[PDB]
From a paper:
The high-quality map of the T = 9 shell (1.86 Å resolution) allows for accurate modelling of CsoS2-C that tightly associates with shell proteins, resulting in an atomic model of the T = 9 shell comprising 80 CsoS1A hexamers, 12 CsoS4A pentamers and 60 CsoS2-C. Of those, interfaces 3 and 4 are unique to the T = 9 shell, whereas interfaces 1 and 2 are present in all three shells as previously reported. In contrast, the angles between two hexamers in interfaces 3 and 4 are arranged in a planar fashion, markedly different from those in interfaces 1 and 2, and also different from those measured in other BMC mini-shells. The cryoEM structure of the T = 9 shell at 1.86 Å resolution enables the characterization of CsoS2 and its interactions with the shell at atomic details. It is clearly well-resolved for the most of C-terminus in the cryoEM map, allowing unambiguous assignment of amino acid residues of three fragments of CsoS2-C: F1, Arg712−Arg731; F2, Leu773−Gly823; F3, Glu829−Gly869. The cryoEM structure revealed that the F1, F2, F3 fragments adopt completely different conformations from the AlphaFold2-predicted structures. While CsoS2-F1 and F2 interact with three CsoS1A hexamers, CsoS2-F3 acts on the interface between one CsoS4A pentamer and two CsoS1A hexamers, with the extreme C-terminus buried inside the cavity formed by the interface.
Carboxysomes are anabolic BMCs for autotrophic CO2 fixation found in all cyanobacteria and many proteobacteria. The carboxysome is composed of a polyhedral shell that encapsulates the key CO2-fixation enzyme, ribulose-1,5-bisphosphate carboxylase/oxygenase (Rubisco), and carbonic anhydrase (CA), which dehydrates HCO3− to CO2, the substrate for Rubisco carboxylation. In this work, we synthetically engineer α-carboxysome shells using minimal shell components derived from a chemoautotroph Halothiobacillus (H.) neapolitanus, a model system in the fundamental studies and synthetic engineering, and determine high-resolution cryoEM structures of the shells of variable constituents.
Residue numbers in the entry:
A (entry chain E), D (entry chain I), E (entry chain H), F (entry chain D), G (entry chain F), H (entry chain C), ...: 6 to 97
B (entry chain X): 712 to 731, 773 to 823, 829 to 869
C (entry chain G): 1 to 81
C-alpha cells in the first residue's frame, strides 16, 4: 500500500511505543522516525489505507498515556509525488 | 562544627549516601485521527467504522500490551517575558522619527 | 491608475516622521521616461511591472487617510510586457 | 486478505445469519465455521481491513437478535504470523 | 525457553485474541490450541520465564472482555518431562 | 514561476498535511522542509502567483486542525534575488 | 537482549542517574542515549525480559528526584521487527 | 557599506518575510540567516547606514504581523572590528 | 579517581561559573560540557569521592543565583562500566 | 587579560548588541559566541579585571532593551586552568 500514516509525540518513548503498536496492529511498515526539534518526534508508516487507519488508531491509543503523550495522528491516503521527497523511505 | 566545602549546598546535592448537517461543526469537533481518518462527516453504508460492541485492534488491545509509568524554553514561550520600558526618542529635526511603527533599536538600545 | 516598472530603491533618511517605515521605489512608465517615487505597499523587486494609484486613494493605499503619499504601488501585474 | 473477522454465537442459526450478513456487506472470504463445543459457533472471515470492519459490523448487527444471540465480535487487522497456524484456511 | 504459559477461555474468539496478544507481547512461541469441551478453549505458549510472564499477563488482559471472557491464566516455569507427552508441540 | 508560498506549523505532521494540500491544489513545486527549531516546521513552494495563492490558501485551510496547528501562511509574489540564497532549491 | 527498556528524562543528569541505576540493577546492555531535543533525554537498554523489568523499575525510582525528574519509564518485552530499525545498537 | 542591520523573529516565515522586505527596501546585502535555537531566527544585512536604517525599518514593519511575529529590529551603524568575527559573511 | 559529579544549569553562564567553582574547590578534573538542548547545560567532573563531593557542593553553591539558575547537582561515586560509553572523557 | 566576562541573552540580536557594546566600552577581546539551545546565546570576553567590569556593565545596559533581553551578566576574575578547556579561545 501507498497510504501514509503519521503520529507526532512529545518525546521519543511515546514515539517508539506508537511505532510498536502501529506495526503490531495492522499490515504497515515503518518508514521513518524524525526528530522535529523542541521535543517533537514523528513516526511514519506506509501501507493500505484501511490498514493505515487501523494502525494509526492503535498507535494513538497506545501512546496517549505514555510520557508526555500524543500530539498528532494523521492519515493521507495518497500523498502527492512532490511530498514523497520530504518523506523518509526507510527507517534508520 | 567543621567548616569548609562540606557545609555548602545543603539541600541541593543528590546522590550522596544520606540522600540515598451531514458533517459535524468544525469548531467543536476534534477528530481522533485527522485527514483521511476523520470521523466528523457522517458516512452511511459499509464504511470502515467500528461498532461499540466490537472488540480488538485499537483501544485497550493496543495500550495494555506494554507496561508504562509516567513521571518550556523557546522563542514562542518567551513572547511574554518581562521587558524594560520601551526606549523613547527625544531628538528633533527631520530624521524619519516615526513613533507609531514597530520598535527599532540603535546602538546602546537607543530608539531609532 | 498607471502601469509602471520598478527601477530601484529610494532612501531619504531625513524624511518626515509621518511617512512611517514604508519603503520607497523609483518607478517610470518605461526606461527613459520621467522618474517618479511611489510608496511600495506590496514589496516589489526591480524590473517588476506594478499598478500605481495616485491622488487621494494613494494615501489610504499606503495605510491611513493622512499618509503623505500621492503615488502608491497597490499590485504587481501578473504578466506584462 | 490479511485482516481477520470473528463472530461467536450461541448456536448455529445466528452464526449462519452473521456469515450471510458479513459476506453480503463487504468483500470478505469465509475461511471457517468452527463448532467450538458447548453450543458456541465461531465464523471467521478474512479480507482487507476496511472490508473486514464493515463485514463484522453488519454481521454483529444481523445476528444480535437471532436465536440465543451474539457472544463476540472481534477484529484483528493483522494477526501474529504464528497465530495463522491455528486459523483455518477453508471452512470444512 | 522451557516455561509454559496457558490461557483458558470460554469460547474460541477470546482464545484467538489471547494467543495473538501473547505472541505480540513477548518472545514466546504458540504451541497449541485445544478445544476442551463445554466451550472451554486453551491456548499454550512456550518461552523464557520472564517472556512467558509478560505474554500471559498481556493475553489475560486482552481476552478478559472479549466474548465470555477468561477462565484461567497460568504459568509453569519448568515443565516435567512426563507432562510434555500431553502437550502439543506445533499448533494446528 | 518565482512566487514563494510558505506555511509554518507546530510539528511535522501538520507541515506534511499542508505540503500535500498545497501540491494537490495547484501547480507548485515543494522546494523545502525546514526544521526551524523549537518545534517550528516550514514548508516552502514555488510557482506562479495565482498557483501559489491557491496552494497557500488550501494548505492553510487543511493544516489548521492537524496536531498543534498552523503558525504562518504567507505568500510573496516576487522574491528578491538576495533571499534566493537562503531558500532551499530542492527538499530532502 | 530482546526486551527493550526505556527511560525519558528532563535533562541529562537524571538520564545518567537512571542509566547507572538500570545497569547496576540487572543484566541489561545500554544501547543508546538520545538527545531528543527540547531537553528530553532518553536512555535505552536491552536484555532479557525480567532483567529489563528490574532495570526499568530501578532506573525510574533512582531518577525520580534527580534534576527535573522523570518523564516516562517504559518496557516493551519484544518490539516489532520493524521497530528494530529505529533503535540504536550501541551508544555514541 | 559596513553598517549592520538585524531582525530576529519567532519562526522562519517572519524571518524570510523580513529579509525579503529588507532587501526590497534599500541597497543591503543579505549576509546571514541564523537558526538561533528554540524557534528564534535572525537575518542580518550589511550596507550603508542610511540604507540599513531604511531596510530594517521596512523589514520590521513587514514582519511584525507574520506568524509568531517580530522579536528584535536592531541597527549597528559602526560595527566594532571584534564583532566582525561572529558575524556571517555570506548566507547558506 | 572515578567518581562522577554533574551539575545541570539553565544556560551556559551558570554552568561555566559552576565549573570554575568545582575545579577551584577540590582536586577534580573537568571532563565534559554538554549542551543538552532546550537550554540545559551539563558539566561533568571526575575524581575521588571526597573531591567530587566537595566540588559538587561548591559548584552548586556558586551557580545557584547565576542567570536562570541551577537544575541538578548529583554525585555517583562509582558509575557502571556501561555508563562510561555515554560519558565524555575530555571536553571541547 | 585573564578575567572572563559573559552575558547570556534570549536570542542572537541582544547577544550581538552586547558584544558590540562590550568591545566598544573597554579593552576586552571577544573570544566566543555560543548558541546554547532553547534561544540562549552567550557572549564571552577576556581582559583585565577593571576592563571586564566596565565591559560587562556596558553590555548588560546596552542589551537589556534589545529583543527578548538579558538573562545573565557574570564576571569570573580568575578562571581556573581546568575551565579553559571549555572556554572558546577564538570566536566563530
Amino acid at each position: 500500500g501507498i497510504a501514509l500514516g503519521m503520529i507526532e509525540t512529545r518525546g521519543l518513548v511515546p514515539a517508539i511505543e506508537a511505532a510498536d503498536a502501529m506495526t503490531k496492529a495492522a499490515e504497515v511498515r515503518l518508514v521513518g522516525r524524525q526528530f522535529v526539534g523542541g521535543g517533537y518526534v514523528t513516526v511514519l508508516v506506509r501501507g493500505e489505507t484501511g490498514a493505515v487507519n487501523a494502525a494509526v488508531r492503535a498507535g494513538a491509543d497506545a501512546c496517549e498515556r505514555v510520557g508526555d503523550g500524543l500530539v498528532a495522528a494523521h492519515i493521507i491516503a495518497r500523498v502527492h509525488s512532490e511530498v514523497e521527497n520530504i518523506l523518509p523511505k526507510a527507517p534508520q | 562544627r567543621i567548616t569548609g566545602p562540606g557545609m555548602l549546598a545543603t539541600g541541593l546535592i543528590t546522590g550522596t549516601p544520606e540522600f540515598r448537517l451531514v458533517c459535524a461543526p468544525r469548531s467543536d469537533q476534534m477528530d481522533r485521527v485527522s485527514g483521511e481518518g476523520k470521523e466528523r462527516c457522517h458516512i452511511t453504508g459499509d464504511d470502515w467504522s467500528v461498532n461499540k460492541h466490537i472488540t480488538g485492534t485499537a483501544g485497550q488491545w493496543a495500550s495494555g500490551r506494554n507496561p508504562s509509568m509516567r513521571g518550556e524554553t523557546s522563542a514562542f514561550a518567551n513572547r511574554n517575558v518581562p521587558k524594560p520600558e520601551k526606549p523613547g526618542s527625544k531628538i528633533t529635526g527631520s530624521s524619519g522619527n516615526d513613533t507609531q511603527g514597530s520598535l527599532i533599536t540603535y546602538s546602546g538600545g537607543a530608539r531609532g | 491608475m498607471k502601469i509602471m516598472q520598478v527601477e530601484k530603491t529610494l532612501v531619504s533618511t531625513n524624511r518626515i516622521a509621518d511617512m512611517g517605515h514604508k519603503p520607497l521605489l523609483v518607478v517610470w512608465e518605461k526606461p527613459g521616461a520621467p522618474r517618479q517615487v511611489a510608496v511600495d505597499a506590496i514589496g516589489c523587486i526591480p524590473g517588476d511591472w506594478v499598478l500605481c494609484v495616485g491622488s487621494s486613494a494613494a494615501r489610504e493605499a499606503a495605510g491611513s487617510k493622512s499618509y503623505p503619499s500621492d503615488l502608491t504601488i497597490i499590485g504587481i501585474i501578473d504578466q506584462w510586457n
